[PDB]
Amino acid sequence: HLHTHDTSGNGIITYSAATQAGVDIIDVATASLAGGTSQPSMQSIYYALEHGPRHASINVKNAEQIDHYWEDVRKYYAPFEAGITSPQTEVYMHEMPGGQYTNLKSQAAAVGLGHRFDEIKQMYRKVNMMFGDIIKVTPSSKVVGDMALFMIQNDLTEEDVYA
Amino acid sequence: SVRKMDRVLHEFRIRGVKTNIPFLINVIANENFTSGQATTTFIDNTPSLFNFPRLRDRGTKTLHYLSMITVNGFPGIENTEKRHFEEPRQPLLNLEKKKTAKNILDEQGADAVVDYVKNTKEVLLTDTTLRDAHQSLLATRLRLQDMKGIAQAIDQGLPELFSAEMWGGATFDVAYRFLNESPWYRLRKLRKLMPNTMFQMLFRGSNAVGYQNYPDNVIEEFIRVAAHEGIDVFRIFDSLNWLPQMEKSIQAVRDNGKIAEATICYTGDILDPSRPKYNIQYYKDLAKELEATGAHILAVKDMAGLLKPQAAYRLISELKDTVDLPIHLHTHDTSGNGIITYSAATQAGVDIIDVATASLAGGTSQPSMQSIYYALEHGPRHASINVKNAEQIDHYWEDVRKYYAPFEAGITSPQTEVYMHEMPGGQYTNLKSQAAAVGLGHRFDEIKQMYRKVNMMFGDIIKVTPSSKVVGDMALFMIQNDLTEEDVYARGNELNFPESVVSFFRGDLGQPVGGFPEKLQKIIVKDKAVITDRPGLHAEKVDFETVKADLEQKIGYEPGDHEVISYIMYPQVFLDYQKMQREFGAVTLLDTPTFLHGMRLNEKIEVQIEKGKTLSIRLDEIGEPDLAGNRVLFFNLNGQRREVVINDQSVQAQ
Amino acid sequence: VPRGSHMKKLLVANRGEIAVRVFRACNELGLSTVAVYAREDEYSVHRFKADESYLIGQGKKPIDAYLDIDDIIRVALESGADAIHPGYGLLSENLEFATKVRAAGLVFVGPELHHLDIFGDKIKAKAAADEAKVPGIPGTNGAVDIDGALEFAKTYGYPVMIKAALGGMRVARNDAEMHDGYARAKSEAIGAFGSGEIYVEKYIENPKHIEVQILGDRHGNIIHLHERDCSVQRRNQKVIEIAPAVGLSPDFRNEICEAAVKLCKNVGYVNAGTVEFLVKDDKFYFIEVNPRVQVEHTITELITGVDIVQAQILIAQGKDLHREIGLPAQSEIPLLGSAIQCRITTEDPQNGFLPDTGKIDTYRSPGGFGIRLDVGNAYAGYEVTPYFDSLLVKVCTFANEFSD
Amino acid sequence: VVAKRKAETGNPNQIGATMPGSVLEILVKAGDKVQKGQALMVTEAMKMETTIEAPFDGEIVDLHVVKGEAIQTQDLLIEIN
């Protein structure tokens, strides 16, 4: 059972590749709550596979109809939208899961470093390597974040930490 | 002594009463005065002393515009209060110097560009961020002021690009009509900031960027001026894939030394044997004809994002075996399948694909530039782009996009129903507005459904601007008046069908594939004139001398060739643009948040109105409206207090 | 005459009253003008008096913005200016600046690099005065260490004046103050002026400060425009200046003027400069050359009829003082009554002359016969900031008789 | 006292009264086409007569005064498009 996020804009193609490799089950979200840092779309992967050797099992017309409800409902949550839903390939560099990204943005705000968030993404990556190259998912991802923020806040390099 | 007087007279700043200073200035300029020989009858006998220039005032038009928007809002969006925005991020680039397609075009010509493309192993990219991406996502509202802040970084940072699509489609009239800025100014400004990037436009074969029926000489002149002003690549299409409407444009682009892409619009589904009208043989036969026109490159325009990946692969592989021209594929990511379709097309040998920067990608835009790079990175064929530079540049666009919140269509996400109704993006949002204005918003799903039925009733047609509007107007009309398809055939003689539908069936958009359904055509057209040849042949003759003199009279100065052609394309819009320039001045120079929202109390802005002239403007007070709606704002403009009266419309319309 | 001396457009690398003074001269000479301004100075009058203006030194402290050599040159090149007038203060005596201006192909309205080098350094300037046979003040051979300084005080005695080469100065009355004085001045030298070299002079008791206005062209003409008495000082800072030196005899004044001319002829001085002397009981001693226009040039203009700033610009254009600029021979240089200049500032005399800040509510300036105003930043509604000097307006009066 | 609509500052489509006085004669009406310099109405200040001329070619939008009406400085007289 494979689970990915569509943060890079490569989620559908990755699921289609996994399908041809014989994956049994994939995690998809309804179109109107899909893409960006969510899962790839359920309805999309149906149609990517439709004319191939292996199909997705879903009533796609019922799913499209259900998606209308979710589209309408999502508008209620405008105040909580992280920002515009679009691909972001820098994830390959920093490797933050979505929540570690928005949280880390809040934390840098509440300590007045919002204006250097790109240095922080960069530090997150350096911290990860400093710690041995680790798996970053909650809460290990927070460990890496707290450290990167701390290091920027107090102006330290990797040399500085060892010294 | 005279020079000092002249200096002092010009230096005086007196406001609130008139003075005799302009008269004094004239007297001391005159040689009777400066020679010392004036007599008591000199002034009384020199009429040239009583001619005074118009005292020029860009400051005052600016305060008028800022007051209008501050108090009354920007037309057609919510009159809200202006957010504080940081400066958009600037990219940190790692520059690599390379020869570009544009350098080859300029040095060696179009056929040498074609050879460069044929010899490239990687898939090449065209960036749509400056045209199609915002046309789809932001109602074509993206402003020059935002484009020019990043243009040079794109030119230097992304020299691998085949071209940037930056003109045509809806940008031409939206610029004039809604942004109060010239599309030609946009082209000149960007052309200078991006000297090594080919500039691509979308060009409708029959009428360039307009929607009337223009004669051939107009289309040829448009191409001449566009090519002279810096358009390198013309993507020529026709809304019904009707080659006679494309032929002359292709030849004129060739004659002007530029690159012509001849376009096929994709519709239907080549992999559906129950829909043979637009099957693979259809596309190969049209491709062969387009190749014979002498077009440099074949474009496949999937305007609705219908192409699924196994169909992309079959389509491209077959076309590459059919013609020798490079193939340039254009899709939309509306279904969420755009990247996988481009990857399929890449494996089939596609030469160039259209991509948008990530922050303006997805949804009804193009697939992401940065994404396709990483999809292909570990494959047999890569994308040619500096991806790290592209990621840095995307920061700027991500910041700039926030300014355009009032124009967002809604949340950017996949929507697969496009396979069913086949509306291109704009046809979808428009058709939603139109149904709103007539109080049918609550039945928009029945309308998507009717759009699909109308398409089949009309014979199964290619739906791109303006044929897509034809299908939309009809579907709306049919829902509004409660008709089924039976009803139209039964009671059509006594119904008045929408304008666009009648024009379609009169042949005013050209001839469609397979002709019209005959009965319905009779029903619809009634006693109007039907043509079956190229509409351009019937166009009112146009004399550029006559038009230029008429226009000069109308605007009060000698119009350049670009203005004359604008006026011909969009006469009333061009004239209305002129009136807005006269009232509000060059609003193009305002930062986007100020352009849309005006100013907050105690805000300071800086407007760069020329090189070496900046207006520092601070809003000190916003007066309450009196009963007639008069409000008085007090600004500080460059150290002076300025009192500005604006009428508060909400009081007027109470 | 340097290549490229023709001018259509001039940029002032300065702010305030002196920038407005240069723009007025430019406009009268048919030149278009360019201003530069720091962000914090965005409401300065000089920004709006120019034909075009540009922000400089983005993100720097305001004084550093006006010392930003490359950004100023950037603007000059971007605006298409021909020439930079450096005004006074700021970069006007700065060799590096003038070098880079001229290296960027622009006319620097001022003297030759060599003159900025020898007159910008007060040790070098004394050496040039000896060489020209102009009496100086007994001082150390060159720059000195604390031991060579103490030596001087043994040779000539106290009190003594400790001065930085780039002033920047302290009086020493004894050994304790010599150790303290040398330290404090070597601080402010590496501090506000960048370098730490130091020399010592005999301190003269109750001198007058007399200075002579010079103009030199590129055709070997040099003239003086008489002298100015700038003795009215507070803590060695000029407060009121008068012209001519009405308390000295004409003969003695002429002698001072001739000595200035002698020095300037010796070094081939070009453009406007001033030679400064201390005067005590009918002797005079060279102290300094300011190789630039001075704040008090105004009163010399009033008593001679000569527009000094227009002259500077015409000189830089390669013109001849006599044939083209139209100045008479030395003995025909007018001497018309007298003139006095005061600088009205926001310095509060009841609060230790700390400059006041805040909004100017009311500003009504007098005029009439015998009054000249050269305004800085003073107009109703202007906010005086703490970032710059405290000048509001320079007032000069002039009349036939000193008492009037 | 209901205030009169004022002409917007810097708006060349709106012609405001330059001095207090009154309206003697109106020569045009809503909808009329008009040319630069054409006389639109006549006003008085201290029984001196001024003729209001059209600043450019255009169509009259509306009048905001009536014959013999009193006016003060800035009052909107006529709007043009």
Ligand SMILES: Nc1ncnc2c1ncn2[C@@H]1O[C@@H]2COP(=O)(O)O[C@H]3[C@@H](O)[C@H](n4cnc5c(N)ncnc54)O[C@@H]3COP(=O)(O)O[C@H]2[C@H]1O
């Ligand atoms: N053996 C392998 N090793 C490593 N990676 C592998 C792989 N097989 C597939 N992939 C990855 O999965 C992507 C999707 O392949 P899939 O067969 O699902 O979906 C394909 C399919 O829908 C279509 N496609 C490609 N070749 C095709 C063909 N010959 N006939 C029909 N459709 C084709 O294009 C999609 C994109 O294929 P593309 O090759 O660009 O991108 C491939 C590739 O990146």
Ligand SMILES: Nc1ncnc2c1ncn2[C@@H]1O[C@H](COP(=O)(O)OP(=O)(O)O)[C@@H](O)[C@H]1O
């Ligand atoms: N050797 C000295 N003896 C007495 N007073 C001096 C001496 N040198 C300078 N001063 C005082 O300081 C003032 C400024 O002198 P100057 O050398 O021009 O310094 P600055 O560079 O600040 O103009 C003089 O007018 C004088 O009052």
Ligand SMILES: [Mg+2]
């Ligand atoms: Mg001095």
Ligand SMILES: [Mn+2]
């Ligand atoms: Mn498109």
